[PDB]
Write an enzyme that holds these catalytic residues in place. Structure first.
Site, PDB file in Angstrom:
ATOM      1  N   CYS A 177       8.010 -16.215  -8.417  1.00 57.73           N
ATOM      2  CA  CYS A 177       8.136 -14.689  -8.530  1.00 57.73           C
ATOM      3  C   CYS A 177       9.693 -14.310  -8.306  1.00 57.73           C
ATOM      4  O   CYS A 177      10.351 -14.311  -7.039  1.00 57.73           O
ATOM      5  CB  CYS A 177       7.434 -14.164  -7.165  1.00 57.73           C
ATOM      6  SG  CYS A 177       6.494 -12.564  -7.377  1.00 57.73           S
ATOM      7  N   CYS A 349       8.332 -10.157 -17.256  1.00 60.81           N
ATOM      8  CA  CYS A 349       8.212  -9.326 -15.855  1.00 60.81           C
ATOM      9  C   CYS A 349       9.067  -8.141 -16.235  1.00 60.81           C
ATOM     10  O   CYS A 349      10.108  -8.203 -16.484  1.00 60.81           O
ATOM     11  CB  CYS A 349       8.778 -10.289 -14.959  1.00 60.81           C
ATOM     12  SG  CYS A 349       7.232 -10.708 -13.793  1.00 60.81           S
TER      13      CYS A 349
HETATM   14  C1  LIG Z   1       5.839 -12.010  -2.261  1.00 59.77           C
HETATM   15  C2  LIG Z   1       6.006 -10.904  -3.346  1.00 59.77           C
HETATM   16  C3  LIG Z   1       4.816 -11.027  -4.441  1.00 59.77           C
HETATM   17  C4  LIG Z   1       4.601 -10.104  -5.438  1.00 59.77           C
HETATM   18  C5  LIG Z   1       5.719  -9.069  -5.590  1.00 59.77           C
HETATM   19  C6  LIG Z   1       6.770  -8.904  -4.541  1.00 59.77           C
HETATM   20  C7  LIG Z   1       6.717  -9.789  -3.561  1.00 59.77           C
HETATM   21  C8  LIG Z   1       8.123  -9.858  -2.620  1.00 59.77           C
HETATM   22  N1  LIG Z   1       5.689  -8.160  -6.612  1.00 59.77           N
HETATM   23  C9  LIG Z   1       4.534  -7.803  -7.412  1.00 59.77           C
HETATM   24  C10 LIG Z   1       4.408  -7.072  -8.282  1.00 59.77           C
HETATM   25  O1  LIG Z   1       5.474  -6.249  -8.312  1.00 59.77           O
HETATM   26  N2  LIG Z   1       3.509  -7.083  -9.079  1.00 59.77           N
HETATM   27  C11 LIG Z   1       2.391  -8.009  -8.901  1.00 59.77           C
HETATM   28  O2  LIG Z   1       1.481  -7.835  -9.830  1.00 59.77           O
HETATM   29  N3  LIG Z   1       2.668  -8.848  -8.043  1.00 59.77           N
HETATM   30  C12 LIG Z   1       3.420  -9.026  -7.250  1.00 59.77           C
HETATM   31  N4  LIG Z   1       3.650 -10.084  -6.187  1.00 59.77           N
HETATM   32  C13 LIG Z   1       2.592 -11.065  -6.173  1.00 59.77           C
HETATM   33  C14 LIG Z   1       1.348 -11.002  -5.262  1.00 59.77           C
HETATM   34  O3  LIG Z   1       1.777 -10.697  -3.967  1.00 59.77           O
HETATM   35  C15 LIG Z   1       0.379 -12.174  -5.655  1.00 59.77           C
HETATM   36  O4  LIG Z   1       0.579 -12.579  -7.078  1.00 59.77           O
HETATM   37  C16 LIG Z   1      -0.885 -11.822  -5.056  1.00 59.77           C
HETATM   38  O5  LIG Z   1      -0.849 -11.611  -3.515  1.00 59.77           O
HETATM   39  C17 LIG Z   1      -1.862 -13.134  -5.401  1.00 59.77           C
HETATM   40  O6  LIG Z   1      -3.022 -12.619  -4.859  1.00 59.77           O
HETATM   41  P1  LIG Z   1      -4.260 -13.603  -4.426  1.00 59.77           P
HETATM   42  O7  LIG Z   1      -5.321 -12.813  -4.035  1.00 59.77           O
HETATM   43  O8  LIG Z   1      -4.291 -14.758  -5.640  1.00 59.77           O
HETATM   44  O9  LIG Z   1      -3.749 -14.282  -3.397  1.00 59.77           O
HETATM   45  P2  LIG Z   1      -3.078 -13.914  -1.915  1.00 59.77           P
HETATM   46  O10 LIG Z   1      -2.529 -12.640  -1.829  1.00 59.77           O
HETATM   47  O11 LIG Z   1      -1.908 -15.152  -1.257  1.00 59.77           O
HETATM   48  O12 LIG Z   1      -4.300 -14.096  -0.838  1.00 59.77           O
HETATM   49  C18 LIG Z   1      -4.500 -15.423  -0.182  1.00 59.77           C
HETATM   50  C19 LIG Z   1      -5.748 -14.996   0.377  1.00 59.77           C
HETATM   51  O13 LIG Z   1      -6.486 -16.256   0.885  1.00 59.77           O
HETATM   52  C20 LIG Z   1      -6.461 -16.312   2.084  1.00 59.77           C
HETATM   53  N5  LIG Z   1      -6.293 -17.563   2.629  1.00 59.77           N
HETATM   54  C21 LIG Z   1      -5.341 -18.442   2.706  1.00 59.77           C
HETATM   55  N6  LIG Z   1      -5.512 -19.754   2.728  1.00 59.77           N
HETATM   56  C22 LIG Z   1      -6.722 -19.762   3.375  1.00 59.77           C
HETATM   57  C23 LIG Z   1      -7.643 -20.655   3.961  1.00 59.77           C
HETATM   58  N7  LIG Z   1      -7.099 -21.888   4.065  1.00 59.77           N
HETATM   59  N8  LIG Z   1      -8.831 -20.301   4.181  1.00 59.77           N
HETATM   60  C24 LIG Z   1      -9.373 -19.115   3.990  1.00 59.77           C
HETATM   61  N9  LIG Z   1      -8.571 -18.078   3.454  1.00 59.77           N
HETATM   62  C25 LIG Z   1      -7.380 -18.398   3.127  1.00 59.77           C
HETATM   63  C26 LIG Z   1      -5.548 -15.289   2.864  1.00 59.77           C
HETATM   64  O14 LIG Z   1      -5.740 -15.198   4.336  1.00 59.77           O
HETATM   65  C27 LIG Z   1      -5.396 -14.225   1.921  1.00 59.77           C
HETATM   66  O15 LIG Z   1      -6.473 -13.633   2.244  1.00 59.77           O
END
Ligand SMILES: *Cc1cc2c(cc1C)nc1c(=O)[nH]c(=O)nc-1n2C[C@H](O)[C@H](O)[C@H](O)COP(=O)(O)OP(=O)(O)OC[C@H]1O[C@@H](n2cnc3c(N)ncnc32)[C@H](O)[C@@H]1O
Ligand SMILES: *Cc1cc2c(cc1C)nc1c(=O)[nH]c(=O)nc-1n2C[C@H](O)[C@H](O)[C@H](O)COP(=O)(O)OP(=O)(O)OC[C@H]1O[C@@H](n2cnc3c(N)ncnc32)[C@H](O)[C@@H]1O
Lengths: 356, 356
Positions: A177, A349
């Site tokens: 990213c 992007c």
């Molecule tokens: C960091 C960031 C990301 C970002 C962005 C700017 C920044 C600083 N700007 C974006 C933008 O302008 N447009 C866009 O479309 N995306 C942008 N991003 C990215 C976005 O944050 C990620 O692409 C997105 O969050 C991906 O989502 P996903 O649902 O695939 O994953 P996640 O958000 O990390 O959620 C993870 C979930 O799973 C749970 N989890 C994690 N590990 C476990 C385990 N072991 N067991 C159970 N649950 C687990 C987490 O708690 C969370 O709920």
């Protein structure tokens, strides 16, 4: 039919809600997330002078989900046994559960490998950590002057096996990213300009590889020209290894002066996926699938969002896109004829455009 | 102080209104446009099934302008004599006039060189012509099946003299506005898909050069992969020379089958600028300036929008940006201290992203 949905954000919630709404009672949809609440803020902060704009959505999965016919169980996934179709997870009380599924939708995202950065603990400022962005806000406010380093860590992308998708649908990136880095560099300039501190503050932008690789060479030279005009330095091929109080060090021993280090940590696969059925995941810890989000090896495993190999860059809207496709394809399998949307690579992007 | 503003759209109107509002009575702002009305529709049409969405803004310059303290004169500029500071123009009645200015803001845009395309008269469908997009709407509706060719003509970009701007601020492009081609190709596919005609309709996209040159090679290969998936053919380096009833021919004798040809005509400089003081314009017929929009040769000539050399791609928002900068800089000159916004190159067209 029992469908387990792992995680609680873009990919997971989209798949769960979409699936339940499509098949209704034809299946039991249960979500397992490491926490009870899911928070949704704005990607990048609002660094304005004397004006702090708070804006967050706080979802209580235990109440929000049942309200839609979706069960919820809090627990931290430790591994998935694709061969036996079992999900192992630790419950809040510390106990270890092993539950089985007919279908699983993996939405646990990736991992921000801050642990790979020596000194992160004591001197790091992350852009991707919840209220970690509050610690930065204060430091940036009290900043008298000095050096600032902004950039991202390397992307430990997986390469084998490969997703079963059309050619060129998955790019190879050194950063997962990088767009937010460009935007933040421009914001920091505007903030310090409004405080008449351009001469007191010096910003360096660093990239693990070539900066903004989705762009042509001219477009990249153009971005470099903007930086030059703004007095921003650019250092390419700088893979961060350590953060000290006044500088950052790369893997080759090179340094960049930094009294404030704003870092988007390196991306690696989710540990729980690295510890799962070896042939479910690629060498990065991501799940390679086809265009229907179905694993190339286990037909009853779906991967959505960041956890899926094809989501490069790692974007929330690609998460939503994939979450929806996984749900539509599964619905068809459960006897509810549904149109399965076509997946598209992002191409570029939009944050690369300064007028955005 | 007398300020002449040439043209009546994005660049001109932005400069006129912005200038008048900033300096008020400190100057006489007069607009000279080849027509009394200026129309503003949506960039790309709305090809929906059974749903035609009309939406246009029709401005009467003779009434809209005076209402803001801006005089208006209808006339077609024939040339600008930068040496004597005179603008020559033909009035509607056929008479010739010439007015002296203290300052001139050139916003007469470029030229769509349809004349460079043999058969355009009898077989062409333009995307950039007002109600020409209505002729296409009907043809696309009654289309039984066959071949469709969509693309743009070459961009006759000027190169010398060069704008006085930072390095890499002006890209070299084979096409002046290519993004709309990608969007339209995707729309046409969706429209014919909804009519169950994908097997009856065959779309070919053609480019004068590379195909979306602001993107990296992978991103370009990725766009090509999308086309392949959608059954859309892509032909690069095809500089259109002629349009026949069932095919189009390039400069090397190559052909593309086309029962319908949707073309964004080639871009060349405005003839009135080609016929102006030779050293006011570059070899393309565009006015090279510095970042303040001031000609590099005549300090009392401003160029905005499409007429300015640096606006590549030729975008309406860059027109607005430049129109505003020209007005702010001039206001400062007329004794009204104003902040002059910084110009930025676009870097990338957001239409390159299919999720846009
Ligand atoms: C960091 C960031 C990301 C970002 C962005 C700017 C920044 C600083 N700007 C974006 C933008 O302008 N447009 C866009 O479309 N995306 C942008 N991003 C990215 C976005 O944050 C990620 O692409 C997105 O969050 C991906 O989502 P996903 O649902 O695939 O994953 P996640 O958000 O990390 O959620 C993870 C979930 O799973 C749970 N989890 C994690 N590990 C476990 C385990 N072991 N067991 C159970 N649950 C687990 C987490 O708690 C969370 O709920
Ligand atoms: C064709 C097109 C353009 C386009 C687009 C899609 C299509 C199909 N999509 C765009 C988008 O998504 N975003 C964006 O920002 N821009 C987009 N564009 C481009 C936009 O049309 C142009 O960049 C814009 O129109 C440039 O504006 P400018 O004000 O610089 O020039 P103009 O609109 O051509 O207006 C010219 C005016 O000058 C008058 N004129 C011309 N010749 C004379 C003479 N000899 N004498 C007097 N007046 C003259 C014209 O009548 C007009 O008023």
């Amino acid at each position: 039919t029992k469908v387990l949905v792992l995680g609680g954000r873009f990919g997971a919630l989209t798949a769960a809600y979409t699936l339940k709404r499509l098949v209704g009672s034809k299946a039991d949809v249960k979500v397992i997330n490491k926490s009870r609440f899911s928070y949704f803020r704005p990607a990048l902060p609002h660094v304005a002078i004397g004006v702090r704009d708070v804006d967050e959505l706080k979802v209580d999965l235990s109440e929000a989900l049942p309200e839609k016919g979706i069960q919820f169980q809090e627990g931290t996934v430790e591994k998935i046994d694709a061969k036996s179709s079992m999900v192992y997870y630790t419950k809040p009380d510390g106990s270890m559960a092993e539950e089985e599924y007919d279908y699983v939708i993996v939405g646990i995202g990736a991992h921000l490998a801050t642990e790979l950065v020596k000194g992160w603990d004591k001197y790091g400022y992350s852009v991707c950590e919840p209220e970690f962005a509050t610690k930065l806000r204060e430091k940036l406010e009290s900043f008298q002057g000095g050096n600032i380093a902004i950039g991202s860590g390397p992307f430990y992308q997986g390469h084998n096996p490969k997703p079963k998708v059309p050619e060129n649908f998955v790019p190879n990136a050194d950063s997962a990213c990088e767009g937010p880095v460009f935007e933040m560099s421009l914001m920091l300039h505007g903030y310090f300009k409004k405080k008449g501190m351009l001469d007191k503050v010096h910003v360096t932008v660093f990239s693990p590889g070539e900066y903004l690789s989705d762009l042509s060479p001219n477009s990249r030279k153009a971005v470099a020209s903007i930086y030059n005009q703004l007095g921003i330095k650019l250092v390419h091929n700088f893979k961060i290894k350590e953060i000290r109080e006044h500088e950052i060090v790369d893997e080759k021993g090179n340094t960049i002066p930094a009294d404030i280090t704003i870092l988007l940590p390196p991306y690696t696969g989710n540990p729980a996926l690295k510890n799962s059925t070896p042939d479910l995941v690629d060498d990065g810890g991501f799940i390679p699938t086809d265009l229907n989000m179905v694993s190339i090896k286990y037909d009853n495993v779906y991967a959505v969002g960041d956890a899926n190999s094809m989501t490069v860059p790692k974007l929330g809207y690609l998460a939503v896109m994939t979450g929806r496709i996984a749900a539509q394809h599964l619905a068809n399998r459960l006897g509810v004829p549904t149109k399965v949307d076509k997946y598209y690579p992002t191409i570029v992007c939009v944050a690369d455009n300064p007028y955005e």
